[PDB]
């Protein structure tokens, strides 16, 4: 009995660009401290994994584990009601055919619900993360983004190379 | 009050105290919520490192603020390069510390060194990341698919990628 309160919807709208753009479905895993993502590509190369806090929420309840497989493309489009700074809320009941979207911004100001139908995805989760890894290195995200941008413009195939 | 506490992976911890609250009891605070014991941890605020018995009205710290945590170690060459039928790229990069805003460091630590190539529009994917987190965390092997990691405020956006074989 899912309802799960982003205080801005920007940010959810954030997260899903990320699975967008490379995987068209993804589970969702409720779950009473929060919820978790996890989604394949198509050539099983990439494996995109999210989690999301209880902290992450302006309020987050949800009493029993719920799992929602969702077409992107669709929700997306849902999330481009978003106006980014309004209240997002996810809602489901136990067992859920749709989950409901909620947006409502400053005051009573506006209110809008959607519902985005649920489709049944088979559960296989992946738990591919190393204990040990030969090199780990952080730097400014955009650098990163900058760089992978150049390289991207000579050639299919960026090489890393640590020493 | 509070202040904002800037780790060198993107991550922004919240934390709030007293002016009275010296530079040995914040910083013993912040390993009392994200695993770095404070010994591993440097602050340095216009600067000016920070030292354990001065107190933050010293520093004139007010509210709202932004400290720099740093990272030390008790213990060279990143290279991305692309390369193909009209050129050929290279960006080396090496790790640093930034003074006036270190949130622009470079941190790495080397196991092995690694050679590893991967597809670009897997990485094209991938930096679209860059829009949750200020940094980003890369973890890299020749035994297992490369890591790369943006950390939300409590949670995270994980990208597991396999290198090429030819």
């Known amino acids: ?163 | 009050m509070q202040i904002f506490v800037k780790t060198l992976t993107g991550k922004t911890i919240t934390l709030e105290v007293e002016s009275s609250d010296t530079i040995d009891n914040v910083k013993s605070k912040i390993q009392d919520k994200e695993g770095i014991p404070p010994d591993q941890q440097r602050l340095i605020f216009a600067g000016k490192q920070l030292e354990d018995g001065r107190t933050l009205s010293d520093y004139n710290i007010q509210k709202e603020s932004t400290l720099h945590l740093v990272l030390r170690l008790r213990g060279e060459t990143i290279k991305f390069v692309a390369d193909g039928d009209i050129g050929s790229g290279s960006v080396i990069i090496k790790p640093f510390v930034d003074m006036e805003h270190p949130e622009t460091s470079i941190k790495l630590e080397m196991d092995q060194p690694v050679d590893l190539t991967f597809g670009a529009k897997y990485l094209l994917d991938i930096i679209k990341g860059s829009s949750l987190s200020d940094r980003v965390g890369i973890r890299l092997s020749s035994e297992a698919p490369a890591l790369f990691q943006f950390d939300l405020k409590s949670g995270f956006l994980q990208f597991f990628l396999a290198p090429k074989f030819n």
Request: a negative charge; one cysteine or more.
């Open chain 1, 1 to 163: 009995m899912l309802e799960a309160k982003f205080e801005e919807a920007s940010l959810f709208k954030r997260i899903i660009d990320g699975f967008k753009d490379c995987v068209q479905l993804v589970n969702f895993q409720c779950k009473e401290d929060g919820i978790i993502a996890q989604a394949v590509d198509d050539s099983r190369v990439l494996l995109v994994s999210l989690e999301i806090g209880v902290e992450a929420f302006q309020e987050y309840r949800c009493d029993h584990p719920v799992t929602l497989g969702m077409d992107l493309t669709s929700l997306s489009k849902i999330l481009r009601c978003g106006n980014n700074t309004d209240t997002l809320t996810l809602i489901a009941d136990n067992t859920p055919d749709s989950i409901i979207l909620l947006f409502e911004d400053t005051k009573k100001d506006r209110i809008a619900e959607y519902s985005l139908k649920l489709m049944d995805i088979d559960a296989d989760f992946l738990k591919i993360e190393e204990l040990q890894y030969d090199s780990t290195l952080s730097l400014p995200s955009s650098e990163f983004s900058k760089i992978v941008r150049d390289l991207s413009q000579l050639s299919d195939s960026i090489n890393i190379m640590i020493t």
